[model samples]
Target chain A: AYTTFSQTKNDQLKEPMFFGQPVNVARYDQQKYDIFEKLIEKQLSFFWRPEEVDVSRDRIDYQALPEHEKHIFISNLKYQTLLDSIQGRSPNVALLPLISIPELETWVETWAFSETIHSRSYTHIIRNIVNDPSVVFDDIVTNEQIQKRAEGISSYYDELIEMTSYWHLLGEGTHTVNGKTVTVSLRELKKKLYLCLMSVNALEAIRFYVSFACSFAFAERELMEGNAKIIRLIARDEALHLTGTQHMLNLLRSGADDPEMAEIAEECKQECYDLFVQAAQQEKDWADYLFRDGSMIGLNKDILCQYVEYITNIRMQAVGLDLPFQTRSNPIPWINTWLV
Target chain B: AYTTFSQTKNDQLKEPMFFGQPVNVARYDQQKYDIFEKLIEKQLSFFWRPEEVDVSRDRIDYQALPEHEKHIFISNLKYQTLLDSIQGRSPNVALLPLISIPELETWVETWAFSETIHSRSYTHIIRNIVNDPSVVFDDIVTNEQIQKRAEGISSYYDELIEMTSYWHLLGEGTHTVNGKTVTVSLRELKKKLYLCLMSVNALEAIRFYVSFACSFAFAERELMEGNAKIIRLIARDEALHLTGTQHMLNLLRSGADDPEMAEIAEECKQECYDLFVQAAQQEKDWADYLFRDGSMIGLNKDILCQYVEYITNIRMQAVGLDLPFQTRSNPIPWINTWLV
Candidate 1:
C-alpha cells in the first residue's frame, strides 16, 4: 500500500519534521522542506550510468606504470569500493524512519539508491582492469592501512545505527540487558546521527577527494585517461553526494528539520572537527604507503601528502571546521590538468 | 566514510542474516547470493513515471459526479495516500539495515522509492480533481473507518520496526525497563519480520487490487480514463513489488536466506491467513462505506466486496495461505478492462 510516490494533499505538508502527521502526498509543488527537493533536482540533473564511460585502455596504461603507480591505482580503487559500500545503504537505513515530510524521505532513498549504482560501477571498473576482482576486493580488508582507516569511518555509522535501533525499538528509556544499562533516547540517537553524518561528510569531503587526486594524477600524464574519465563521472556524482551530506549537516544545525538535531550538531561540532583532522592525517599516511615501493614520475609521497593537507583545509572549511594544517600550495599542480 | 554508499570493501558479505559480515561490493554482476539479484532486475525493469499519463479529464468528470461518487473516489484516494505514506518509508526504514545481500538491499530501497513516486502521483491527481486538496487529506486520519484500518496496517510495521531496533542494537537479552521486563531474541525478531512482510504482501497483492477495480470502474464508463491510466502504471509497479516480496518470503521460508526465517514463515502461516482474511473483510466493509450513499452503474458495494474475496483467494494461495473464500469469479469482470 505504501510506495515512494505518496499521493498526499499538497496542503498538509506544512507539519514539522519527525512526528508531524505522516505525509499524505509526495508533490513537489510546494515543500515543507526545500533542501531535500533541491537535492532531488540536483541528483536528477546529474544523471549518469557506468556504461557511459569506457575505461578499456587503462589496462595498457597499467602495464606501463611503475610498481608504486600500480599500488596507488589499485589501492585507491579499493578505497572507493569501501566508501560506496557504506554509502549504498546508509541514507535509506538511517534517515527514512525519522522523516515526516515526503520530499525529504524520498530524497534520502533516491540519494541512497543512486549510490548503489555508483558502487556497482566500481565493480565494473575493477573486474575489467584486473585479472582477479577478489584479490583486489580481498586486499581491502587484509591491507592493514585501508582497514584501520575504514574502521574509524565505519564505527561512527555503526554506533549511530545501533543507537537508532534502540530509539526506534525501545523509545526513550533506560533499558537493562544482561546486567548492562542502555539508554535509548531520540536525543542520543540524533547525536549519533549528527556525528555519523559528520563522519560521512569527512569521508566525502577529504577521503574521496584525495583518491580522486590520485586517479586524475595518472591522467595528467596522458595515461589511463579512460579511467580518469570514469572517475570524473564518479567525482561529479560525489559532488551531489557531498552536497547531500552538507545539506543534512546544515539543516540539522539550522534546526530547520528537527530542532533536536541542531542541539545534536552543536554538541558534536568539536568531535566532527577532530574527525576531519584524523581522516586527513590517515589519508596522508595512506599516501606514504602508496609510494613506499617507489615514487611515480609526476607524483610522490610528499606531494600526495601535501595534496591531502591542502584539500583537507578547504573541505574542513566547507563544514565550518577550523583548519588544523598550515596552508600549503598544491604540490601536484599537474593533477588539475586532468580535472580540466 | 559511510555515506549510504560504500565505495570500497570492508569485510566478507558471505555471512548469515544479521551480525555476520558487512557486505563489501555493491556489484550485481555477482551476488553473495542470487535471490536479491533477481529482485533488482525485476524492480528496475518495472520503472515508471506518474507524469507519463494524463489525468486532465478526471478533474472535469469528478466535478460532474454526484456527491456519493465523489465520496467513493475521494475516500479511496485518501486510503491510498495512507497506504503509500506508510509504504514510502517503512520498507527502507524497517528492512534496509537487516538486508544481507547487496542486490536485495538495493532492490528494497528502489522498490520503496518507486512507492514514493506513486505517492506523489496521488497528490497530483487529487489536486487536479478538487479545488481544495485538504478536503480529502483531512478525512484520512479523522475518518473513523479509515483510521480503524490504518492502525491495523501501520501497527504491524510499527511493531516490526520496534523489535528490529531492539534486535539490531541490543541482540538477545532480558531487560527491565520502566519496571517491565523486555525479552529480545533473533527468533522473535525474524518472526516479526516475516509476518510484517506477509502483511505488506497482502496490502500490495489483495488490498491494492481491490482498489484498482474501483479506479478502473470509472474508466469503463469513459469517465476518468486519465486517472485510470495512472492507476494502471501504479498497478504495473505494484505487480513487481508484490513479486519481490513473494520471492523474499519464499526464499526466507525455504531457508535459503536464513533457517530461522524459514521456520518463522512456516509458523506464521496461520496468522498470515487470518490477517489476510481480516484485511479482506475490512476491505469489504470499506466497500459498504464507499457506496453508502448510492451505487454507481458499473460497481456497487456487493460486487466490490466479492472482488475482494476473489483476489484475496488468489493471493492467499500464492503465499501458501489456505484459500478461505470460495474461488468465485471476478464480480465486475469488465473491470478487468485494463488489468489484463
Candidate 2:
C-alpha cells in the first residue's frame, strides 16, 4: 500500500499532511502550505559542516577542566548524541511513508538531515576532547541514566511505526494474525501520530533545549568554548526543527489540513499534555543525573528543573496544550545569548 | 522489532552494513566502512542551493525553442523530476530500517537529502521555463513515457520496502498474516537489498548521466546555461551517490562485511545483470522518446544509446556483475566538462 511512487494523480494542495496520498512528483513551485517550503529554503540556507568549526583548543580545554566539570560537559554531550541518534533516522523511518505533500515531505527529509549534521558535530566534539572516543560513545547505551531517557523518546516513534505497518499492510479493519485479532483504525493511527508529534515536539523543543543549557553553561564560564561554538550552531538548527514540529502539531489541531486530525488532536489532548509532562519529568530526572556527580557554577538540578518547567510551558502553549506547570521565568537567561 | 535506539553496547566498527545489530549511538569518530563517512564529508562539502544558480535566462531560451525542441527539453526535465521525487524519499524509507551501522545509515539519509535538493532544482528550472509550473509537474505522473520509467525505477524500492516490513514485523519464519500464510527469510531480504543497491547504482550511474547529457547538450550550444549549471551541480552530487552504492555492492559481494550477502550477491549476479540491462533498455527507449520530436545538436537517439551501453558496462563491472554489452569508450566526451 505504501508505494514509493503512487501512480494516482491528485492535487497536492488538497491532500492532508499525512495519510492522504504518497507524493509521486516532488514539485516545490507550488505548495498547499508555504511554511514548509519556506522552511526548506531556510534550512538549505543554513547548510554547514562540523569541520568548519575549529575544536582543537577544546582538547586543551578538557585537559584543564576539573574532574567534576569534565563530567558535566561530557555527559551533557552524550545526552545530546542520544537525542540526535534517535532523531537522525526515526522521522524519516516513521513519517516518510505517510507524508502526502511534496513540500512537507522534503521538509521532513531536510529537517532529519540537519539532525544528522548535529550527530556529526557530537563526534567532532567528542573526538577532540576525549582520549578514547569509544569510552564516551559506548557509555551512551550502557549508562542507565541515559537509557531511561532513551526509552521515553524512542517509544512513541516505535509505536507509531508498528501501527503504521499494520494499517498499511492490512486495511482499516480487524485482522487475525497468529490467532490474534488486531484492529487497525485510521482514527487510532491518527491519534498515535498526533501524540507522537507532541512527543517529538517535546524532544526537540524541551529536551534539546535543556541539554543546550548545560552545554552553554560551560561557555558561560569561558571553558569549552569550541564545543560551545559547535553547540551554538546545532542549537540554531534545532530551533528550526522544534519550530517544524510545533507547526505540524498546531496545523493538525487547527484542522487546517485534515479535519479528522483535528478530531484526533482533541481526543488525544490529555495524552498529549501528559506526554509533554512526562518528557519534562524525564528531563528533570536527567538534570539530576547530570548534576549527580557535581554541579557546575551556572547550572544545577533545581535551576535546570525551573528552566525545564519554564520552557515546557512555552512549548506546550505553542501547540494549544494547557500549561502543565506553574508559570515561571527563564532560569538560565544567559543561554539565550548562546542560542540563535 | 525495530527500536529507535538499541541499548546494546557493542563496537560499532564490528557491525555489518545491514541486518546486524541496529546502531545504538551515532558516532563518527570511527567507522566500520570509512568510505561512507568520506562520502558524507564530500557530499556535505558539495552543498548547494538550487537558488544559487540563476535560471532566469533559461526562460527566454526555452521560449525561443521550436515546439519539438521544447517537447524534448521539458520531457527530459519532467523525467529527471520523477527520478529525484522517488529517490528523495525511497532510500530513507526502505534502507533506514535495515541499516545496522552508523556511517552507512547516515550516508543513506545524506544521499537521500541531496536528492531532495536535486528535486528542488527541477522546480527552480521548471518554474522559470514555463508559464504554469503545474503544466509540467502534473504531467510527470500522468505522462505515459515518464510514468513507464517511473514504474521501472520505483518498483525495486517499493518491493524492498514491503518485504522489509514483513521482516521487521515478523522475524524469519512462516506466519499467517491476515489469513494468508507468509514466509519471511533474512537471506531473501538481504538479496533484495543488494539488488536494490544495484538498481539504485544504475539510476545514479546510468540514468542520471543520460539526462545530464541532454541538459549539458543544451549548454554545449551556449543555451540554457542556467539549467546546465544546476544540472552540473546535481551531476557532481550524483557521482558521489553512485560511488556510495557501487562500494556497498562490491563490499557485499567481497564477503568483507556479510558472508550471507556475499552468497546472495553471487546468486543474484544474473538478476543484477538483467536489472542493469533492463534499466539500460528503458533509458535507451527514453532516448527515442526524447528525440522523437527532434534530435538535439550533439546528442541523438543513436549517440545516447551508445552512451547508455558504455555506462551500463562500467557500472555493472564496478559491482562485479558481468557486462551485458560490449565495453566501449564514452560517446559524449564533451559532457565531461559539465560533470564533476
Candidate 3:
C-alpha cells in the first residue's frame, strides 16, 4: 500500500499534509503548504559544518574547571548527544513514510539532516575537551539519568514507527499476525501521528532550549566560548525546526488539510497536553540530576527548573495547549546573549 | 523491535554498516568507517539552492524552440523530476531504519536532502519554461515511458522498505502476516540491501549522468543555460552521492564490516549484474522515447544509447560486478565539461 513513488497521476496541491497518496512527483512550482517550502529554503540558508568552529581552546578551559562544574558540563553534552542521536534519524524513519506532500516531505528530511549537524558538533566539542570521548558517548546510553529522559522521547517515535509499519503492511483492516488479532485503522494512526508531532514539538521547543541554556551558561562565565559558538548555530537551526513541527500540529488541528485530523486533534487534546506536561517534568527531574554534584556560577537546579517551567508555558501555548505551570518570565536573561 | 534511541551501550566502532544495532549516538568524534564522515564533510561544503540560479531567461529560450526540441527538453525535465522524487524520500525511508553507524545514518539523510534540492531545481526549471507545470508534473506518473523507467528504479527501494518493516516487527523467523506465513531472515534482508544499493548507485552513476547529458546539450547551444547551471550544481552533489553508495558496496564486499555481507554479495553477483543491465536498458528505451519525435543537434537516440552503455559498464565495474555492456569509449566527451 505504501510506495516510494505512487504511480497514480494526481494533483499534489489537492493532497493533505500526510496519509493522502504518497507524494509522487517532488515538485516545488507550487505547494499546498508554502510554510514547508519556506522552511526548506531557510534551512539551506543556515548550512554549516561543526569543523568550522574552533573548539581547541575549550580543552584548556574544561580541564581548569572544578570537578563539580566539569560534571555539569559533561552531563549536559551527553544529554544533547542523546537528544540529537534520536532526532537525527527518528523524523525521517517515522514521518517520511506518512508524508503526502512534497514540501513537507522534503522539509522533514532537511530538518532531520540539520539535527545530524548538531550531533556532529557535539562530537567535535567532546573530542576536544576529553581525553577519552568514549566515556562520554558510552554513558549516553547506559547512564540511568540520560536513558530515563530518552524513554519518553524515543517511545513516541518508536511507537509511531511500529504502528506505521503495520498500517503500511496491512492497510486499514484487522489482521492476524502470529496468532494475535491486530486492528489497523486510519483514525487510530492519525491520533498516533498527532501525539508524535506534539511530542516532537515539545522536544524542539523545551528539551533543546534547556540543553542550550547549559551550553551557553558555560560561556557566560567566559569559558568554552568555542562550544558556545557551535551551540549558538544549533539554536538558530532549532528555531526553524521548532516552527516546522508547530505549523504541522496547528494546521492539522485547524482542519485546514484533513478534517479527520482536526477531529482526532480535538479528541486527543488532553493527551497532547499531558505529553508536554510530562516532558517538562522529566526535564525538571533531569535538572536535579545535572546539578546533584554542585551548581555552577550562573546555573543551579532551582534556576534550571524555573527556566524549564518558563519555556514549557510559552511552547505549550504556541501549540494551543494550556500551560501546566505558572507562566513566568525568563529566569536566566543572560542566556539570551548566546542564543542566535 | 526497533527503537529510535537504543539504550544499549555498545561501542559504535564494533558495529557493522547495517543490520547491527540501530545507531544510538550520532557521534563523529570516531567512526567505524571514515569515508562516510569524509563524504558528509564534502557534501556540506557543496551546499546550494536551486532558486539562486536565475532561470528566468529560460522561458524565452523555450518559447523559441521547435516542437521536437521542446519535446526533448520538457521530457528530460520530467524524467529528472521522477528520479529525484524517489531519491528524495526513498533513501531516508528505506535506509534509515537498518543503518547502525552514526556517520552512515547521517550520510543517508544528507544524501536524501540533497536529492530534494535537485527535485526543487526541476520545479524551478519547469515553472519558468512551461505555462502549466501541472501537465508536465502529472505526466510523470501516467506517461507510459516515464512510468516504465520508474518501476525499475523504485521497486528496489520499495522491496527493501517492505522487508525492513517485517524484519523490525517480527525479527528473524516466520511470521503470519495477514494470514500468510512469511519468512524474515537477516541474510535475505542483507541481499535486498546490497541490490538496492547497487540500484541506487546506477541511479546516481548512470541514469543521472544520462539525464545530465540532455540538460547540458541545451547549454551547449547557449540555450537554457540557467537550467544547465542548476543541473551543473546537482551534478556536483550527485558525484558525492555516487561515491557514498560505491564506498558502501565495496566495503561490504571486502568483508571489512559485516563478514556475512561478503558471502551475500558473492551469492548475489549475477543478480546484481542484471540489475545494472536492466537499468541501462530502461534508459536506452527512454532515449528512444525522448527522440521518438526527433533528436536535438548534439544528442540523438543512438548517441544516448552509447553513453548509457559507456557509463553503465564503468559504474558496474566500480562495484566489482562483471560489466554488462560492450567496451566502449565516452560517447559525449563534452559531458566532462558540464559535470563538476
Candidate 4:
C-alpha cells in the first residue's frame, strides 16, 4: 500500500526511479540521478512571479490592434491558457505517485509549480488587457478549437491517472469493476507512463512552441512585448521542462535506470512516434485556426506549420525518434532572439 | 471521469474548494478565496535557496559540541528532515487531485514546493555539519523514535490518499473488490479529508515549531548560528505554510464554501481534538528523547514540554479547538526573537 512517509528503511540510491519504495527521507547528499538535482537548483534560481512582469503597456498594445489581430491575440492567449491550465496540475497529479526518486519527485513538483506561474501570468495578462477577463476564460471550455486541443492533451494525462489509481488500489493482476472486466499490470502501467511522457514532451516541445511563435510574431511588430517578455521567461522555463522530460524518456530508454522501462520504451517506440505526429498535426491545425482570419507579419499559418515540423523533427530526434516531416530551415528565425 | 481538463464550462466562483470539479482552468484573475492568492504572493516573495546561506562555519561548531549535544542536534535535524520529506510530496499527492479552485490548487503546489526547499535545506545543513550525511539520513527510517512520529503523521495523509484513490477510480459507491465489500462515499471521503487537514494543521502548527526551538536554542548560546540562520528562513516560510493550512481548515469548518465540509468538520470535532492532543503528546515524548542522553544548555525536556503545551494551546485556539493541556507562559521566551 502507498504511504506518504514509507517507514521501511532503504537506500534511495538503490531504489529504481519508479515502482521502488516510496522515498522516505529526502536527502540530497546523494542522488540516483543528479540531473534532477541540478534541474531543481536551476528551477529555483529561475523562479519569478507573474506580477513582477509589467503587462500594463500591453493593454494599449492589445487595444490598438486591428479587429482580426484582436481575434489572433486573444485567441492565442486563450489557447496558451488552456495548455498551461492542464500543464499546471496534470504533471503532479499523474506523475507524482509513480515517481520513486526524491530528486525526480521534487523536480516534477517544481516543473508543475513553474506551469502554475505561467498560468497565473495568463490571468495577469488577461486581466490587464480586457475589461472582463471572464469572457476570455469562459470561452476556454466553450471554444471548439481550444477544447479540441484540450481533449487531446488531457486524454493522455487522464488515462495515466485512471490506470495509476487502479494499479495503486489493486496490485498487479486482473480485477473486475462495475461488472466489467479490467486488468491492471505494472508493465502495462509503465507503458502508459512512457506514452504519456511522450505526449507531454510533444506538448512542451511542440504545442507550446507553436503558441509562442504567435505571441512572438505580434511582438516582432513591437506589440504585446510585455506579454512577449513574460513568454520569453516562460520559454526559458519550458526549455528546461522539455529537457527534463527528454532526460526522463532518454534515461528510461537507455536501460540505465529501469531495465524494464527500456524494454517498455522499445515496445512502445512506434506508439511514441505516433504520439509526436498527432501532436505535430494538431499544431498544424492550430496554425490554421490562429491565422484563419489573416496572416500576420513574420508569421502565418504555413510558416507556423513549417516551424512545427522543423522543431518537431529536432525534438523527436533528441528522444531517439525518427523524423515525421521533411527537414527545413526555421520559418521564424527572428523568434530565436526571443527564446532563451 | 477525472479529466485533467474538464471541458464542461463551470463558474469557478461557485465551485467548492474540493470535490466541485477537477479544476480545468488554472485562473487567478479571480478567486473564490483570496487568502490563497495572497499566500501565493507571500510565498513567492520569500523564495530562497539553501546555498544562499553559508553554513560552512557550523562544521567546526558542530565538532566542538559534546556528544550528548550532538545527539540532541542530529536527532532534531533527522526529525526535521522527516517532516519535510513527507511534506515535500504529500500535499501535492493528496490534495492536488481533489482541489477545484485554481488559486487553492496553485497554493498547495507552492506550499509543497516551499517544503522541498526546506527538505533541501536539511541536506544543506546536514552536509555542511556532518562528515557523512548518509549515516544521519540512513537513521531516519531505522530510528524507532522517528519512525513512530512518521507512522502517525503519515497515517492521516495515507488514509486520505487511499480513499481519494478509491473515490477517483470507482466514483463514490459501494462496491465489491477482492472478494470483499469496499465502499467509497464522497461524504465519507470528505470526512476523511477534514480529518487529514486537521492533522496537517497540527503538523505545521505543532511538530515543526518544536524543531525550530531546538535550532534556535543552539543559536542562543552562539553555537550553530549558521544552521540557525537557515532554520530561521525555514521558520519564516513555515509561518506562511501553517497559516495556509489554518485557513484551509478554518474555511472548511466555516461552511460558507462547502456546507457539507462544515458538517463534516462539526461531526469530527472530538476526533480533531484527539489529533491535537496526540500530536502534542508525541512532541512531549520527543522532548523526552531529545534530552534522554543529556540536556542541552538552552533547552531541556521539561522546558520543551512546557513550550509545546503553550504553543499547542495557541494553535488549537486559532482553529477552534479547545486546549488539551493547561495553559502556561512561554517557557522559552528568548525564542521569540528568532521567529518571523
Candidate 5:
C-alpha cells in the first residue's frame, strides 16, 4: 500500500533513496547521505519571494524596445514560464511517492516549492511589463515552438508517473489491461527512473541556464534589471537543485544506493548519453525560436547555441554521462556575474 | 493522461478543483480563487528555519524536570513528530496529483514545505533536550498509542491513493483484477476525495491544536520556552493551512468549484460528520496517553478533552458539519494568547 505513514520500525539509514519502505518518520537526526540534508539547509537559507524585488521600472524598458527585440524578450519569458510550470509540480508529483529516505523526500519537496516561486516570479515580471499577462500565459500552450520542448521535457515525468501508478497497484506482476497482457518489471521501471533523472538533470542543469542567459543578457545592458534581480535569486536556487539531482544520479550509479540501479545505469549508458545530447539539441533549437525575429546586442542564436554545448558538456560529466559535444570554453563569460 | 503539462488552452477559471485537466501553465497572474494565491503569499512570508529558534536553553529546563513531567514533554514531542512526519509529505503525495488549479497546486506545495520546517523543528527540540534523539523518534512507529493514531489517519489517504491509481489507470469502468471485477467510478473517486479533504481539515483543525496545547502548557510555567517559541511559529502556519483547507471544503460543498462535488459533499455529509466526530474522539482519547503519568499545572486529561470538544464543534461548523459535541466555552482560555 502507498501509505502516508508506513507503520514499520526500520532503520532508515539503511534504506535506499527510492523503492524502500515508505518513510514512517521524518527524522533528520541521522541520514544515509548528508548532501540532501545539506541541500535542504542551503535552500531554506536562500528562501525568497517574487514580490520582494522591485519590477516597477521594467515597464518603461520593455515598451521602448523595437518590435523584434520585444519578440525575443517576450518569447524567452514565455519559455522560462513553461519550464517552471512543469518543474514546480513534476518533482513532487512524480518523485515523492517513490522516495524512501526522509532527507531526499524533503529535498524533492523543497526543490519543487522553489520552482513555484520561480513560476510566480514570471507572473510578477510579466504583470509589471505587459499590459495583458494572459497574452503570454495563454500562448504557452498553443505556441508550436514552446509546446515542442514541453512534450519532450514532460515525456519522462509523465511516463514515470504512469509506471509508478502501475507499480504501486500491480507490484511486480504481469497484469491484464483491456485484453492486453502488461508486464510490470521493477528493473525496467528502475531503468525508466534512471533515464528520467538523466532527462531531469539535463533540464535543471542545461535548459534552465540557457533561459537564464537570455534573462541576464538584458541585465548586462542595464535593461530589465529588476527581472534579472529575481532571476539571479532563482539561479542560486537552481544551483542547489541541480546539485541535488547530480548527487542522486552519482549515488545510484556508484552502486552505493542500490546495486541494481548501478547495473541499470551501466546497461543504459548509450541511451543516457543520447538523452543528454537530445536535450542539448533541444536547447539549441530553442535558441532558434527565441531569436527568430532578431538577435539582441549581446546575445544571438550562435552564442546561445555555443553556451548550451559548453554547459551541456560540463553537466554531462558531472552525472557520469560522457560528454556528447567537443570541449569548449564558456561562450558567455559575462553571464557569470548575474548568476550569483 | 496526467501529463505534467497538459497541452490544452482551456481557461483555468472554468475548471473545478480536483479533477480538471492537470494544471498546465503555472501562472499566478489570475487565480480562479484568490484565497489559494493569498495563502501561498502568506505562507512564503512566514518562511522560517528551526535553527533560528533558540532551543539551547530548553535543554537546561528539560533536565530539571521530574521523570513524569519529562514523560509528558517527550511523549507530546513524539506525537508532534509523528503528526508532522506524516503531514510533511502527505499533502503533496495525495493532493498534488488531483489538484487542477495552479494556485491550489502551489498552495499545497507551500503547505507541505512548511511542514518540513516543523519536522525539522522537532528534531531541533528533541536533540537539544534528549541525550539521544533516536530514542524518541524510534517510538513514533512502534509505540502502541501513536501507531493506532497513525493507522486511522493514514487510512483515508491510502484508500484515496489506491482508488486514484485505479481511476488513473482504468478510467471509469469495470475491470477485472485477478479473478475479481473492480469498478472505477469518477463520482465515487470524487466522493473519496471529499471525505479525504474533510479528514484532512479535521487533522489540521483539531488534531494539531490538541498537540499544540501540550507544548504551550510548559511555557506557561516559564519552562522550555524555546520549544514553545518554535511551536508558536508552527501554530501560526497551521492557521493558514487549516484556513486553506476550509476554503477548499467550503468551495466544494457550496458548489462554487464543482456542482458534482457539492452533491458528493451532501451525500457524504453523514460520513463526514462521523469522521469529524471520530477525529475529535481520538484527540480526547489522546489526552489519556498524554496525562497517563500525571497531570501538569496548566493541563490535564479532563480540560484537554474539553478543548477538543470546543474546537471540534467550531471547526465542524466551519466546514458544514454539525456539532458532534455539546456547546462549551474554551476550556483553556489562556491558550488563545499563545495561538498567534
Candidate 6:
C-alpha cells in the first residue's frame, strides 16, 4: 500500500531520493527540483494521438516498396515496438518505489505514459503498412533478432526487481528462506538500480538509434512519409526520455541525488562500461543483420554499424564513460537532419 | 539488476505464488493471464490529451463566476490534483513488487502512467483557470479539509509501503531492529495489498465521481464548457479505471488472480468496508465544506450526499460487497446523464 501523498507528516518533500519514503501529499506548490514539472509541461505541450497523424499515405508507399524494403520497414516497426514496449512499462515498474518527490514521481509516470502512445503509434503505423498487424506483433515474440536484444534488456530490470522485492518484503538482512539464506540490503538494491539505469541508457542511447536510422533511410528517398512523421514524433519524445535517463545516471554518479549512489557508481564503473559496450556491440550486430540480405540506396550494413559506434561515443560521454569506439563523424551524415 | 527481460534464467518465472520468484521477462506475447492485456488495450483505445479539448473558454467562464463559485471550481481542481497526484505514483510503488506475471507488471506501469496524464491535465486546467497555479496547488497542502482527506488516503498506503520495504529487505523471520523483534510474513504483505486496493477503489469509485458531479453541474447549465469537455474525457477514462479496480477486487476475492489473495481479501473484508464507508463519509463532509459558503444552482450538500449513497451502492455491489447505506434513487439524477 503505497500512498499518493502523506498529509499528517510534515517534512519538506524537497530532498528525498527515490524509495526513501512514500510521498505523503501531492502538493506542487513548491518543488525541490522543478525538472519533472517542466517535463510534464513539455510532454503535455507535445501532445499527439496516432489518429492525428495520417498514415494513409504510407499504405501506398509501403505497397510500392521492393521485398527487401518491406522487410526493412516492417522489421524497423518491430524493433520500435520492442523499444516502446520496454519503455512503456519499465520506468514505472523499475523506478516508482524509489521515487520520493511528488513531481519526479509524476514525471516518471508521465514519461512512461507518453511511451505507451509511442507504442500505439507503432501499431497504427503497422496497421497502415501491412495487411496484418498481428503478424508483426506476433513476430515481436517469435523473432530471434528482437528477442535476442529484449533478453539483454530484460535481464537487468529483472535483477533489480527481484532484489527490490526482497528488499521491500524482507528488509536489510540475511534471512533463511526454505533452508537457504538470502541477503537483502539497500547497497545491493542501489547497485542493481545503477546497473539497470546504465543498461536502460544503453538501450535508449544505442539500440533505438539503430532503429531510427532505418526509419530515416526510407524518408531519405522520400518514401513512407507518414511513418517517418510518426517516428519523428517518437524521436522527440525519446529525446526527452533519453534526457531523463542521462539525468538519473549523472545524479547517481555525481552524488547529488543520493550520496550512497556515489559509492555505488565507483564500485560499478567497470561493470557499467561493459554493459554500455555490450549494448553497442549488440546494436551493431543487429544493424548487420538488418541489412545482410540487401542494402538500401542511402544506407548499408557497414554504414549503420559505423553510425552505431559514433552514437555510442556521444552517449557514453554523456554518462561519463570513456569512448569505447573511436568513431566520431556519423557514417551517414544525412541521418542527422532527420533526428530532430 | 532487474532487466526489462532476462535471458539467463527461465525456470523461476514458472514458480507459483508471490514469493516463488520475481518476474524475469516483460513478454506480453505470453501472459500468465490476459486481464492485463485487455486493460492495456482498453486504456490505449481510451487515450486522450487534455490539450486536445481546448480549455481557452474556461479562462473567461472562471473569471465571470462569483467568489463562491470560484471556490467551488478551484477547490474541485485542488482535490483532483491531490487524487491524481497520489494515483500517478502509488500503484507502481505499492503493487509492482508483488506482481508475478510480466503482463501484470506492464499493466501496473501502464495504469500509473495514465494517472500521470490525469495529473498533468489538472495542472493544464489549473494554469488556464487561475492566474497563479501555485496558489491553488499550495492550498492543497495547507487547507484543513483537503489535508485531512489526504491523510486518510495516505495512512494505509504509507504503512503498507513501510512494512513492505522492511519485509523485502529482510524477509520473514524475527529480526532485531535496534531493540525490537520484527516479524514479516507473506500473509501480512498480502493483507496490506488487499486493503490498499480497496482504498484505491473507494477513491476512484467515490471521491473522483464526487469531483465529477461538481464539474458536470457547471456544464449542465451550459457554463465552463471547456472544463466540462476535459472532465468528460477524464470521466470516460475513470470508468475504465474503476472497472479495472472492480475486476482486480473480484479476482482477489474469488482466488482467481492470486490464491493467497482470496484468503487475504476475506480477512480484510471488514476493514475494506470500513475504508470505503470512511471515504464516503469524508466525501459527504467535503460536500458540506464545498457548499458551506453557499450551494450552487445544480447541486447542494444534501443532494451531493444522496449522490454519494447512490454511487456507493453501485460500487459496493460490483465487488460483491453488500450495500451498507440505505438504498435510494439518485438525488442528482441529471449528474448521471453527464457521466457514463
Number of clashing residue pairs in every model? 46, 0, 0, 0, 0, 44
Best by DockQ: 2
**Whose DockQ is higher: candidate 5's or candidate 6's?**
5
Candidate 2: count the clashes.
Answer: 0
TM-score of 3: 0.97
Compared with the true structure, the alpha-carbon lDDT of candidate 2 equals 0.88
Candidate 6 on B1-340: residue-level lDDT in tens?
2345433444433554344445543344445556767887777667677667788888998999988898888898889988887887777776765666655666777787777768767877887878977677767878999988887777777777777667665678677654456787778877877787888888888899999999999998888888888888888888878877787788778986578878888888787777788888889999988988898897888888889888998898898777888988788878767786
The global C-alpha lDDT for each of the candidates, from Candidate 1 onward, is: 0.75, 0.88, 0.89, 0.89, 0.90, 0.77
lDDT of 2 by residue, B203-239 (tens): 8899988888888888999999999988988988999
What DockQ does each candidate score versus the true complex, computed on alpha carbons?
0.34, 0.87, 0.83, 0.84, 0.86, 0.30
Interface RMSDs of the predictions, in order, are 4.9, 0.8, 1.1, 1.1, 0.9, 5.2
- Tens digits of lDDT, candidate 3, A281-336: 99999888888888988899999999999999999898898978986788999987
Candidate with top lDDT is: 5
- Per-residue lDDT, model 1, residue B316, is 84
Model 4 chain A: which ten-residue window has the lowest total lDDT? A295-304
Correct interface contacts retained, every candidate? 0.46, 0.90, 0.93, 0.89, 0.88, 0.41
lDDT of 4 by residue, B1-340 (tens): 5778887898889899999887888888788889999999999999988898999989999999999999999999999999999999999999998898888999999999899999998999899989888899889989999988899889999999899888877777789786678988889999988888888888998899999999999999999988998999999999999999899889989998899888888889999999899999999999998899889787898899999999999999999988878866998998899999
Model 4 Cα lDDT, one tens digit per residue, A1-340: 6779877788778888888888888878888888998988898888887788888999998898888799888988899898998898888889988878888998999999999899989998999999998888899889998888888878889999999888888888987776777899889988888888999999998888888888998888999989998999999999999999999999999999899998999999898888889888888888788778887777777788899899999999999999988878887899889999
At residue B326, give the lDDT of candidate 2. Answer: 79
B-chain TM-score, every candidate? 0.92, 0.98, 0.98, 0.98, 0.98, 0.94
Per-residue CA lDDT of candidate 1, range A28-103, in tens?
5567657777787677556566766787887788877777678878988888887787777777666665566767
State the lDDT of candidate 2 residue by residue for A90-190, as single tens digits. 99999998999998899999999999999998998888889998889889899888888898778889999999988888889889988888999999899
Please state the Cα-based DockQ of model 6 relative to the true two-chain complex. 0.30
